[PDB]
Write a protein that binds this ligand. Structure first.
Ligand SMILES: C[C@@H](N)C(=O)NS(=O)(=O)OC[C@H]1O[C@@H](n2cnc3c(N)ncnc32)[C@H](O)[C@@H]1O
Length: 501
């Protein structure tokens, strides 16, 4: 009933001698990747892995990481990716919450980062390496598993970035990850020959396609080394040197790549998603020659749930059409569907919906409602995002249900202000926000970076805006910054923009 592993293995048997991973002039074949992963999967099964059991994984970005995650699935378990640079506490919360059976890790990480209270399977330990390399290396029969793997069995537990709040753990089933990858194979026409770039951190669920989609399709993950993760020059050079057709990043990161490595986007299939895509960015990407495909989706519904090819700068907030076996309801405050063109909160149903939050069963009930247009135990995720349907059936993101109460009797579209600001040649990026620095005095503030070799006069910026937008939308104060604050995932952090006087 685990079609995922059967498909993965069906693929490795049909291209045994192609390359499936490549990292720093090292390549592995499909047969090699799976033999290596099969051996671990047996050793895992001996370490207490079974269906719905969590295998903590703390490994640098490496072929060694991509092999392990594959092993965990083969073992019928579910993986929780830890971060070896994370403070002990971020990692200690996750271990206490998810009760991992075993930690797969490496002996080159400081032994105190891996001293977490779990059993350890350490790949580079002389001995574990001996036992591992000695195990039978064939694909596992279900006899060699702990128990048959169901479609409801967990694939992975990703943890959520709560607004300075208890991190929530999302439980993604196998049928949901299998469904996403199948849709992504179909939308991208991904197969042998094709190279995809694997760069995104494993604790960010946007990585999940970069980790399993090459396995699933017979493409080749070109793993960027850990150092190239933050150097956008080196990534541009890697993209060009190793002829990478497809890569996936947040818009913040795609911006950096254009600023520093314009040539790399020539003939490059960008997958962008995670924040809003400005019209300015969308034009830049297209000017440099990139094929742009936009993906939207909460982590509580796998990774992505909608896709839109961005043909031109108009489409920047068109998040497109639902992926396979996904259903998108845009409903009112009483859970009633709205008429085409009317705004409403986006509810997501179908195969990609998670099982719920991990042992936070109260907040589960508040965000995973019973699927109102489904049956039995089906569930629908309340995204918390407002959308409108255009006549063509495509959807457009409008904003977050919360950040929508009027400012001084008027609805403010904080994107319009940014697009206004981003038309001045002295500005690169703009972010707008409604501030409350003294309670009751809500005010519009906008933030700007500089275009290369220009200085934004932050008073004439208000002039420039005041002739394009309603006066109630002109920011009280504009503020120029050297760089924008970012989240660990490399998204703009609007909660950390400093207040003006
Ligand atoms: C809490 C955290 N673990 C989490 O759930 N992160 S999330 O990114 O998966 O959730 C979705 C959040 O990011 C926004 N978003 C994602 N893609 C977008 C896109 N393509 N266009 C415009 N907005 C996009 C959504 O509107 C919503 O704000």
């Amino acid at each position: 009933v685990n079609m995922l592993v059967k498909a993965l293995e069906e693929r490795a048997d049909a291209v045994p001698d192609l390359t499936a991973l490549e990292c720093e002039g090292v390549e592995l074949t499909f047969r090699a990747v799976h033999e290596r992963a099969n051996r671990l999967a047996r050793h895992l099964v001996a370490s207490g892995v079974g269906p719905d059991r969590v295998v903590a994984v703390m490994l640098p970005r490496s072929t060694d990481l991509l092999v392990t995650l594959l092993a965990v699935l083969k073992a019928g378990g579910a993986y929780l990716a830890l971060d070896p640079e994370h403070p002990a506490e971020r990692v200690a919360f996750q271990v206490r919450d998810a009760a991992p059976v075993v930690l797969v890790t490496s002996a080159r990480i400081d032994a105190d980062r891996t001293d977490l209270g779990i059993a350890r399977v350490v790949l580079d330990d002389p001995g574990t390496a001996e036992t591992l390399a000695a195990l039978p290396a064939g694909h596992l029969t279900d006899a060699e598993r702990a128990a048959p793997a169901g479609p409801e069995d967990l694939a992975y537990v990703i943890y959520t970035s709560g607004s300075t709040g208890t991190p929530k753990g999302v439980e993604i089933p196998v049928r949901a990850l299998h469904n996403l990858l199948e849709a992504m194979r179909e939308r991208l026409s991904l197969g042998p020959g094709d190279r995809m770039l694997s760069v995104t951190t494993a604790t960010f669920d946007m990585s999940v396609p970069e980790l399993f989609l090459p396995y699933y399709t017979g493409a080749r993950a070109v793993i960027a080394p850990r150092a190239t993760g933050q150097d956008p020059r080196e990534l541009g050079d890697l993209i060009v040197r190793r002829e990478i057709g497809t890569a996936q990043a947040t818009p913040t990161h795609w911006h950096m790549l254009a600023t520093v490595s314009p040539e790399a986007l020539r003939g490059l299939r960008i997958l962008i998603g995670g924040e809003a895509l400005s019209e300015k960015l969308a034009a830049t990407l297209l000017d440099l020659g990139a094929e742009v495909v936009q993906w939207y989706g909460p982590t509580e519904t796998t990774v992505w749930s909608t896709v839109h090819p961005v043909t031109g700068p108009a489409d920047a907030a068109v998040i497109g059409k639902p992926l396979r076996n996904t259903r998108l309801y845009v409903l009112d405050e009483d859970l009633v569907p709205v008429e085409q063109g009317t705004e409403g909160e986006l509810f997501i149903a179908g195969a990609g919906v998670a099982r719920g939050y991990l042992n936070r069963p109260e907040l589960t009930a508040e965000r995973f409602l019973p699927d109102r247009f489904g049956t039995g135990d089906a569930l629908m995720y309340r995204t918390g995002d407002v959308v409108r349907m255009r006549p063509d059936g495509d959807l457009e993101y409008v904003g977050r249900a919360d950040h929508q109460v009027k400012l001084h009797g008027f609805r403010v579209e904080l994107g319009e202000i940014e697009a206004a600001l981003e038309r001045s040649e002295d500005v690169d990026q703009a972010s707008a926000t409604v501030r409350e620095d003294r309670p009751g005095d809500r005010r519009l503030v906008a933030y700007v970076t500089a275009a290369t070799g220009r200085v934004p006069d932050v008073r004439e910026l208000r002039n420039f805006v005041a002739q394009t937008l309603p006066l109630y939308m002109v920011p009280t104060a504009v503020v120029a910054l050297e760089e924008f604050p970012l989240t660990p995932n490399g998204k703009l952090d609007r909660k950390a923009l400093p207040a003006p006087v």
